[PDB]
Ligand binder design. Structure first.
Ligand code: GSH
Length: 226
């Protein structure tokens, strides 16, 4: 049954664009091992065919046979349910906490990077560091369930939880380094090992837009502190 994912185009109207939701779904589809195709969409200059399959302009979106699916959460739920054992592996996490750990980081990053006043930067940076620390503690602490030194959020295999979080953390890293010279403290070993382990996996590394695309995507979002 034909699978086609539709994602946002980057700076040249063609490359895969910066977008954590698209990357999340790309990762899920790759980890499932299903045959699928991808199509990029220049939100301004969309094609006639795309203007019809998805009139509301939602992105990403997924075609399953001739059926269009929208909303990243709903698409992911659908894929986990229909691409299932024995043909395709179950990707859901075992430990519920894995599905929330570190997701507050992205919001904290956003607030931090859009602010330009140095008086407020002190507080936003500390809140970002605190959220990184909370994730670091999750990664270094043993998990309740699972047959810490594990590679990923929930054990040693990538799960749906990593597909959501990794694309966001990657953006946090790339954007923070470029626009603020900020790096995730080396003191946070759980976070750095997670990112190193994730980078070593094609499913994550290969689905990241290039750094230039990510930076350019933030050009009118990210501010230098005055
Ligand atoms: N509600 C959608 C949100 C998707 C979304 O945020 N898409 C982004 C990036 S792919 C977007 O449309 N960005 C447009 C822009 O800011 O220019 C979902 O969660 O699936």
């Amino acid at each position: 049954p034909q699978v086609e994912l539709f994602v946002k185009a980057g700076s040249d109207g063609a490359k895969i664009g910066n977008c954590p939701f698209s990357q999340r779904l790309f990762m899920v589809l790759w980890l499932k091992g299903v045959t699928f195709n991808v199509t990029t969409v220049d939100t301004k200059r969309r094609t006639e065919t795309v203007q019809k399959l998805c009139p509301g302009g939602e992105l990403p979106f997924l075609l399953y046979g001739t059926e269009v699916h929208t909303d990243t959460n709903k698409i992911e739920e659908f894929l986990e349910a229909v691409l299932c054992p024995p043909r395709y592996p179950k990707l859901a996490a075992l430990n519920p906490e894995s599905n929330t750990a570190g997701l507050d980081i992205f919001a904290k990053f956003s607030a931090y990077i859009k602010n330009s006043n140095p008086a407020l930067n002190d507080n936003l940076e500390k809140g970002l560091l605190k959220a990184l620390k909370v994730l670091d503690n999750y990664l270094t602490s043993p998990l309740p369930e699972g047959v810490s030194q594990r590679k990923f959020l929930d054990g040693n295999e990538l799960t749906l939880a990593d597909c959501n979080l990794l694309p966001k953390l990657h953006i946090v890293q790339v954007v923070c380094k470029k626009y603020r010279g900020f790096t995730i403290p080396e003191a946070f070993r759980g976070v750095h090992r997670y990112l190193s382990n994730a980078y070593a996996r094609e499913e994550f590394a290969s689905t990241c837009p290039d750094d230039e695309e990510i930076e350019l995507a933030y050009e009118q979002v990210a501010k230098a502190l005055k």
